[PDB]
């Protein structure tokens, strides 16, 4: 299928309680593979998936050095950002960074990403062209002007088209037993009487990987979008995910309702009914 490598960075200031904490994690698809935490006893790039552990000392040291330098840049940029918004030094603020690449079945670049948020709001993003910037506000325009003067987009493009895709392809091969294995959902419907005249039908999908899935209820073959309670897809803790969709049905009408499941690990979509 298609795949992605993404790195996520969070820096959080805490005035009066030391320097901003910097935590960053790396994912391939829905599998985390590294972390770095400036509050760790010994901050370093750490393995978080078995297949990455084979990488040599050079990998570990270079990524560690990168994260140490990034800790310092994020801290200085947080000071800049506070000034851009005329904010006092007394409050806590957040800077987030995500970048990475998506590739198709054939290993080729679909698109790259490089974007930031300040206090949970979009700040600046590299455009899909990997060449130009979109700034969310007049503060981000200051940053844009600096990064344009520095021709930073050009460095990012080289990374996203080259290094990113090359390392994703490497990770996919080293982790081929897991990263290239889709685990289909185990599915069933449960029935929960509410009152003499209604019951809940809940369609379950369990044990699936990757997280992307579609669960929908139909009544007489019509989608029940507005009448379906759909929980957020949640991690089980064993790499897999869980999800359910629930519908409130008049007593005796259960057989008019069908649950429909699509997931990459399934040859064809599944249709389920409550089976008393």
């Amino acid at each position: 299928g298609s795949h992605s490598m993404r790195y996520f960075y969070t820096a959080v200031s805490r005035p009066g309680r030391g320097e901003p904490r910097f935590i960053s994690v790396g994912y391939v698809d829905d599998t985390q593979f590294v972390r770095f935490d400036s509050d760790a006893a010994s901050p370093r790039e750490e393995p978080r998936a078995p297949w990455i552990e084979q990488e040599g000392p050079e990998y570990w040291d270079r990524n560690t050095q990168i994260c140490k330098t990034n800790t310092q840049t994020d801290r200085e940029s947080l000071r800049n950002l506070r000034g851009y918004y005329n904010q006092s030094e007394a409050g806590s603020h957040t800077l987030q960074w995500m970048y990475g690449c998506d590739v198709g079945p054939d290993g080729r670049l679909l698109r790259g990403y490089n974007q930031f948020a300040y206090d949970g709001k979009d700040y600046i993003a590299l455009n899909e062209d990997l060449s130009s910037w979109t700034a969310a506000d007049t503060a981000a325009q200051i940053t844009q002007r600096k990064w344009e003067a520095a021709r930073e987009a050009e460095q990012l493009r080289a990374y996203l088209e080259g290094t990113c895709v090359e390392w994703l392809r490497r990770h996919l091969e080293n982790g081929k037993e897991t990263l290239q294995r889709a685990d289909p959902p185990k599915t069933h419907v449960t029935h929960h009487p509410i009152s003499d005249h209604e019951a809940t039908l809940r369609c379950w999908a369990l044990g699936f990987y990757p997280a992307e899935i579609t669960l929908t209820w139909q009544r007489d073959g019509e989608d029940q979008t507005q009448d379906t309670e759909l929980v957020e897809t949640r991690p089980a803790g064993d790499r897999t995910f869980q999800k359910w969709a629930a519908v409130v049905v008049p007593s005796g009408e259960e057989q008019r309702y069908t649950c429909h499941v699509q997931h990459e690990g399934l040859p064809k979509p599944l249709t389920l009914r409550w089976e008393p």
Binding site: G26, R62, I66, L81, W147, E152
Partner: peptide, 9 residues
């Protein structure tokens, strides 16, 4: 491998 840190904001 990770990308280099960006320039200062």
């Amino acid at each position: 491998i990770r990308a280099a840190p960006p320039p200062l904001f």
